[PDB]
Amino acid sequence: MFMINILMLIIPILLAVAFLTLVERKVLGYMQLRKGPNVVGPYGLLQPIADAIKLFIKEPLRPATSSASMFILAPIMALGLALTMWIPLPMPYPLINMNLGVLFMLAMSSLAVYSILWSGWASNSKYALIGALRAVAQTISYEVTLAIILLSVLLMSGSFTLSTLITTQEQMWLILPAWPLAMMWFISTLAETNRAPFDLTEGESELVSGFNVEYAAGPFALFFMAEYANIIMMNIFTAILFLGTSHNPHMPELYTINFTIKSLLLTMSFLWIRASYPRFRYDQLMHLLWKNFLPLTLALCMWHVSLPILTSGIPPQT
Amino acid sequence: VRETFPEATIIKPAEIFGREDRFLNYFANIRWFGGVPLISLGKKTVKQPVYIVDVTKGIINAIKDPDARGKTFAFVGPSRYLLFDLVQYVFAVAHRPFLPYPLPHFAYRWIGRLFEISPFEPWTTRDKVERIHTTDKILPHLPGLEDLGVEATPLELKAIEVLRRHRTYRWLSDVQPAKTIPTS
Amino acid sequence: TYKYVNLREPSMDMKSVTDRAAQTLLWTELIRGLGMTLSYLFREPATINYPFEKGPLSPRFRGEHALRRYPSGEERCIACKLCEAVCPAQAITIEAEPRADGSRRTTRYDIDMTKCIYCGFCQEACPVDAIVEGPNFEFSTETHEELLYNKEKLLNNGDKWEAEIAANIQADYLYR
Amino acid sequence: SRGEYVVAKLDDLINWARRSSLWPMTFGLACCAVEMMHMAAPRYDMDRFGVVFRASPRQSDVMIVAGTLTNKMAPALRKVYDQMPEPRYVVSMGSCANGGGYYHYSYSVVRGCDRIVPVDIYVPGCPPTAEALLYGILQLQKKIKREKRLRIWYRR
Amino acid sequence: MNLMLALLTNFTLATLLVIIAFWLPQLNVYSEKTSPYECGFDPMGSARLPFSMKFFLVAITFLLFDLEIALLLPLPWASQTANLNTMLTMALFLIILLAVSLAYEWTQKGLEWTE
Amino acid sequence: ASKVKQDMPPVGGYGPIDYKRNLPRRGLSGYSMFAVGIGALLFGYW
Ligand code: SF4
Ligand code: SF4
Ligand code: SF4
């Protein structure tokens, strides 16, 4: 029955990713005064299926002078880690109930940077290796603030257990006590996923190619699924972290409905932001992290270490 | 054909090599299977491959040549090679490791029988193995490419263009010409 | 008369400095940009339902070519070769000779629709309204040869679009 | 069954997938690129047919050659075409790409992009209206809907 | 067990999609294809990418900062101690030295990108 | 004896057409925004 549980998680994720491509093209469409896909199926509902079939029956070009082992490893690593990060999520009951679930999320997230690095190496292009180095430097910079921000929030929750964040917010959302941290967390999850205005590689098209410009067909599709699987997961993580839903043990479906709505709105906020702003220059988004976000995150880490002690509000360890 | 259309021109080429050929490209994808199986280690077969453009210019010159009506030609290359020393050259030009090993005729047909199950273009077949190892006939009594005003192109000149795509590095940095069976 | 676009001195009173600090820290003017795209999400899109709806055009539209006739069915063209002289792209080729009845008519009239720049000079030059650019703009082909029109194709277009070509000329000839 | 029935339906599935997800790489070379940008604009919104605004060469299905193709640019247009994964289609937009157009007799102009690459659809005009280009794309979908790749393979 | 099955399922599914992504489609390869995209023009040099020192310093700065975060991770468990005064002092000492490390790179032009 | 008729403006001309920049003021001042922000923190901490 546990193997049924795994499939009941993986398959819907790959369907949610499929229909996030439809919503992104229709929300961006209407925010640009047009309609988006509405011809392939009713209201475009079959568009993700057509795109899926199309990609997987196209030539999977691999340059002859590309390291085959790394060219294949990168999409497997990216998608494999993208699905792994979903297993500890309390929605409301985790598939795998980890005592250190939060630290597991960080640990797996930092491994995904390899797929960017391996793909750049395997291209043997040097129009993509620079893109990979720029992308990797961006990603590792912004997981510094994710860790310190996440550490600050856990000082009001008490543990790294993901389910304990539900108990912490049983009276009030953590966004009120920690709206300064939530703001930078939201931007930091935009830069980790290479989402606009932090998309210097995927779709910059400013004398800068993407690290996966050399991928075509199914292998490109796999990278796309990993990227979009992470967008939903990061926004589901934000809902649990700052917008905790009340959990009724007798009506657990009530939690899932409310928690599903919040995650969708946060995900649609990613689409909202892409339609509204230009993109940071690469050296500007490094100054955003090292000169603006990092000094403020450090100060709020000091403040959130001493605030429970000086208010006698230290959370329980269990 | 010679009876139905007596005035027809018949061209008999050896294995034709070129960018899209299945002759040099055939002795380069066998790397997918480790070593290179060759019946009798590829020593009892003599090959005289010809260039695609040479065969093409022969056909065109045969259209404008009134002397080609009701005539049979044999388009062959300028040099003769042993199947072993030609297959060695392909790997040398392609810069791929060369691990030849003999295989008996009955066993080589067995694996050819296996690849024939493919409902798509078979990678190899029993008939293909027979032709790869068949020695190219000498027909001195038939006009060649010299009677049509065509000079045969050595395989050495045009092997690099065919086998460039099989190499794994760009701007690697040479290979020696393959051994050739002298005439007579 | 000139005006300055970016010549201003920001005020330096604590009220104004704190407003700019609030904008820097609270992202106020970025969220104001999110409100402009939120409004568009709740407007009616300008998309039309092509091919069931079509974009508006005027009687002056210059589309696919056609050779016209008089009401009797006689060709209007009298092989004067004015359209061939004025054609800035040299897309018109004409050969003519006396017809069996002695009239001045063309034996070749080709428009290379791949040299043509759809400029309308041929219908301005024509003194008998023979060569016109019709209202059709939906004649894309699958081959380059289908776009080398000869006299038969152009006379078929005229007999095909006369009902609509005649109406457009009726609505614009007073401006010509 | 008959075998021909299964292959016939599989063709429809892959034909429907390929025409409903046409991802074009646009070679905006001259004025005809402007009319191509008006087809992406709200009124015609090519994105609503499954045709994305722009795609990189390695994920593009059709090349729209929109504008004059000069001799200097000709080598670069072939290189991009060779690197497009198959199936690949080419739409020649406008007179300049169709046959040379206004600059047919120039010393520096390729008299038609069909000299460099195969062309599946020719869209006439100088420029074609954004609607006449959308008619070409829709006319390319029907061409792909008539493909019989598997029916032919089944009868080999 | 349950964790190993989950990881195996996630990474086996990814591998399956890759194999059917390379074998299902119909292939046709030639030298003009299967070359680096570049931008439609031939490569202008047979040399690898020059080494940029600034990109090397961000990786090292992340590493050293990432090591100091490793020390800050056990803070939630550290706040449960009875020696809160000592714990609080060492918690703030670590974060302050992390900021002093940031201040050094900042003032020494370590965070700039202008050559 | 029909009169000349061509595209002309109506009698009295057309109505006035706005062209100057219009970016209306919105929101509160910096003091109020920080007061709401800190007040939210204080309620949350409590
Ligand atoms: S529209 Fe202009 S270019 Fe075309 S045939 Fe007429 S005169 Fe020539
Ligand atoms: S179409 Fe008109 S201008 Fe041209 S030759 Fe005929 S009558 Fe003269
Ligand atoms: S066909 Fe016309 S619009 Fe298009 S590039 Fe040529 S001159 Fe410009």
From TrEMBL, chain E:
The entry's keywords: Electron transport, Membrane, Mitochondrion, Mitochondrion inner membrane, NAD, Oxidoreductase, Respiratory chain, Translocase, Transmembrane, Transmembrane helix, Transport, Ubiquinone
Main location: mitochondrion
Enzyme class, broadest EC rank: translocase
Annotated transmembrane regions: 55-75, 87-104
Protein's membrane topology: Multi-pass membrane protein
A GO BP annotation: mitochondrial electron transport, NADH to ubiquinone
InterPro entries: NADH_UbQ/plastoQ_OxRdtase_su3, NDAH_ubi_oxred_su3_sf
Gene3D superfamilies on file: NADH:ubiquinone/plastoquinone oxidoreductase, chain 3
Enzyme Commission designation: 7.1.1.2
GO molecular function: NADH dehydrogenase (ubiquinone) activity; oxidoreductase activity
Similarity field: Belongs to the complex I subunit 3 family.
PANTHER family: NADH-UBIQUINONE OXIDOREDUCTASE CHAIN 3
Assembly information from the UniProt record: Core subunit of respiratory chain NADH dehydrogenase (Complex I) which is composed of 45 different subunits. Interacts with TMEM186. Interacts with TMEM242.
Protein name: NADH-ubiquinone oxidoreductase chain 3
Organism listed in the record: Bos taurus (Bovine)
